[PDB]
Design an enzyme around this catalytic site. Structure first.
Site, mmCIF file in Angstrom:
data_model
loop_
_atom_site.group_PDB
_atom_site.id
_atom_site.type_symbol
_atom_site.label_atom_id
_atom_site.label_comp_id
_atom_site.label_asym_id
_atom_site.label_seq_id
_atom_site.Cartn_x
_atom_site.Cartn_y
_atom_site.Cartn_z
ATOM 1 N N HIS A 1 0.822 -1.207 0.000
ATOM 2 C CA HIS A 1 0.000 0.000 0.000
ATOM 3 C C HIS A 1 0.862 1.266 0.000
ATOM 4 O O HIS A 1 1.821 1.361 0.767
ATOM 5 C CB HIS A 1 -0.978 0.004 1.173
ATOM 6 C CG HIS A 1 -2.106 0.971 1.000
ATOM 7 N ND1 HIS A 1 -1.973 2.319 1.253
ATOM 8 C CD2 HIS A 1 -3.378 0.791 0.575
ATOM 9 C CE1 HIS A 1 -3.119 2.927 1.000
ATOM 10 N NE2 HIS A 1 -3.988 2.021 0.589
ATOM 11 N N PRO A 2 0.526 2.238 -0.871
ATOM 12 C CA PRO A 2 1.404 3.384 -1.107
ATOM 13 C C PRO A 2 1.305 4.543 -0.119
ATOM 14 O O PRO A 2 2.101 5.478 -0.205
ATOM 15 C CB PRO A 2 0.982 3.858 -2.501
ATOM 16 C CG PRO A 2 -0.454 3.494 -2.593
ATOM 17 C CD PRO A 2 -0.620 2.226 -1.802
ATOM 18 N N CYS A 3 0.355 4.488 0.810
ATOM 19 C CA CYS A 3 0.073 5.634 1.685
ATOM 20 C C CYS A 3 1.305 6.164 2.421
ATOM 21 O O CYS A 3 1.375 7.352 2.741
ATOM 22 C CB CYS A 3 -1.046 5.314 2.680
ATOM 23 S SG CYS A 3 -0.724 3.867 3.710
ATOM 24 N N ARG A 4 2.275 5.287 2.665
ATOM 25 C CA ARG A 4 3.496 5.674 3.372
ATOM 26 C C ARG A 4 4.690 5.990 2.460
ATOM 27 O O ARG A 4 5.725 6.456 2.939
ATOM 28 C CB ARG A 4 3.874 4.615 4.420
ATOM 29 C CG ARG A 4 3.095 4.706 5.726
ATOM 30 C CD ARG A 4 2.843 6.154 6.128
ATOM 31 N NE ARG A 4 2.792 6.344 7.576
ATOM 32 C CZ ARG A 4 3.729 6.965 8.293
ATOM 33 N NH1 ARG A 4 4.808 7.474 7.704
ATOM 34 N NH2 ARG A 4 3.584 7.084 9.607
#
Lengths: 175, 305
Positions: A127-130
């Site tokens: 997941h790219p959120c970070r």
């Protein structure tokens, strides 16, 4: 922008095509793709929707003995303004692995199953959120060392960091 | 000592999207028809020392009603049945010889010379269970059995066989070939190296062009195989063309493999094979083997859908 890159760790669509072109140039194992015509994104060139690399070996599990191969794509997440890595694992006799078995090749040092924005079926994905925060740290570190990286190299940095998330998948990236 | 030359079997790879793409074709257009469909397969050179490439069916494989660096197009045919029992009642040997015959015709007509990508022509027999959403299939990569089997004389890592200058010049040429869109997916070629140690890659039809100096000539091909002691499957029909056209007794072949996306000559192999010399279509072999045995492959995609 070059300020948005240094301060947010983000990437514009044009800059994504730029960095992606550079990844293909340096590491020809990676290719551009169009994907499903119905799943096309109008803000990206039709022949350049995502980046993929096939038949990538993984000889042991992340916990540090049987050989698996991976297909792994990089899409552009319009919301986070960062790339996203999607992986498809395969058997020792090249049969499709079940998505939850890929977690064994993820370092236990957050990954989730979802639909690909361009392809059929369910893929394991980091997941790219970070990624933004991550990229900002890596930029900061390099800046003071004297290295001033430009956005045409985002993916090379991005993939070096990703190596810590999937250490045993042997894809290409140069520095 | 001159040993019998053994080719490593080609393995298949069907991407998930191919079935999804076909399940739509069968349901929206085809209907009951079990008629064969011509499809496009894709392969490339070896890309890593530990793992060899495959013939890959993607969703681009099915008719558009293509071919980059990592996708060399190869013509194929699909036989999909409507039931399990009709799948089992398929005449494997008549279908294999039917496709192998198409290759031999192209070898005879000078077609394979113009377009050698026709040599790895392949067959797929399948059974798509659109109720359970599971898929039964079997791949075939027809290759001719030469009456007296080809004898291997030597097989060295390409970097051993070549010098340092030669190595540099070959891989510089090889990468150029892979780098220009017109030649990238042409998986069969000639490698000539001048006495000056300068290397250049020419098309198969230019063979006659290539006789000139005290210059070595090598019959190169994209080798999908990674193994350091055997050449890949595509060498079979390749050597068949060489004998059928120019009747060479001794043939130098170049197993072209790469790493990190560029020509790798420690991985690549140079070998010389030996062939003995009205004739018809030889025997064909090669139905892909499952975890070891003459058995078809099955994939259930009910969870993906």
């Amino acid at each position: 922008p070059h300020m948005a890159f240094k301060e947010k760790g983000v990437l514009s669509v044009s800059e994504f095509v730029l960095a992606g072109d550079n990844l293909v140039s340096k590491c020809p194992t990676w290719s551009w793709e169009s994907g499903d015509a119905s799943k096309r994104k109008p803000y990206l060139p039709s022949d350049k929707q995502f980046l993929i690399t096939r038949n990538v070996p993984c000889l042991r599990r992340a916990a540090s003995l049987r050989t698996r191969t991976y297909d792994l794509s990089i899409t552009y997440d319009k919301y986070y303004q960062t790339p996203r890595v999607w992986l498809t694992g395969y058997d020792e006799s090249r049969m499709l692995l079940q998505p939850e078995l890929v977690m064994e090749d993820v370092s236990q040092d957050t990954v989730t199953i979802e639909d690909h924005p361009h392809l059929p079926g369910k893929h394991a994905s980091v997941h790219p959120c970070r990624h933004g925060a991550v990229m900002k740290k890596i930029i900061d570190v390099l800046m003071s060392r004297g290295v001033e990286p430009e956005v045409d190299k985002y993916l090379f940095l991005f993939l070096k960091f990703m190596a810590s998330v999937i250490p045993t998948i042997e894809y290409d990236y140069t520095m | 000592p001159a040993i019998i030359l053994q080719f490593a079997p080609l393995n298949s790879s069907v991407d998930e999207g191919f079935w999804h793409s076909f399940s739509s074709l069968k349901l929206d257009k085809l209907g009951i028809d079990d008629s064969p469909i011509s499809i496009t397969g894709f392969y490339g050179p070896c890309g890593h020392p530990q793992v060899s490439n495959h013939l890959t069916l993607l969703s681009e494989s099915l008719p558009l009603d293509h071919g980059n660096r990592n996708k060399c197009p190869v013509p194929g045919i699909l036989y999909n049945t409507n039931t399990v029992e009709s799948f089992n009642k398929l005449d494997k040997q008549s279908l294999l010889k039917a496709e192998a015959n198409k290759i031999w015709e192209d070898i005879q007509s000078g077609k394979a010379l113009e377009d050698p990508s026709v040599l790895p022509r392949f067959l797929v027999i399948s059974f798509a269970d659109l109720k359970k959403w599971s898929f039964r299939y079997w791949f075939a990569f027809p290759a001719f059995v030469l009456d007296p089997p080809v004898s291997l004389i030597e097989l060295k890592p390409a970097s051993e066989y070549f010098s340092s200058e030669e190595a540099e010049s070959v891989s510089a040429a090889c990468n150029d070939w892979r780098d220009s869109d017109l030649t990238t997916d042409v998986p069969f070629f000639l490698v000539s190296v001048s006495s000056d140690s300068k290397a250049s890659i020419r098309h198969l039809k230019d063979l006659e062009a290539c006789q000139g100096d005290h210059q070595k000539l090598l019959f190169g091909f994209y080798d999908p195989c990674h193994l350091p002691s055997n050449p890949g499957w595509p060498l079979r029909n390749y050597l068949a063309l060489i004998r059928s056209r120019w009747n060479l007794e001794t043939v130098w072949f170049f197993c072209y493999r790469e790493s990190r996306g560029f020509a790798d000559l420690n991985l690549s192999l140079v070998g010389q094979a030996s062939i003995t010399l009205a004739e018809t279509v030889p025997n064909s072999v090669g139905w892909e083997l499952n975890k070891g045995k003459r058995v078809p492959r099955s994939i259930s995609l009910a969870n993906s859908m």
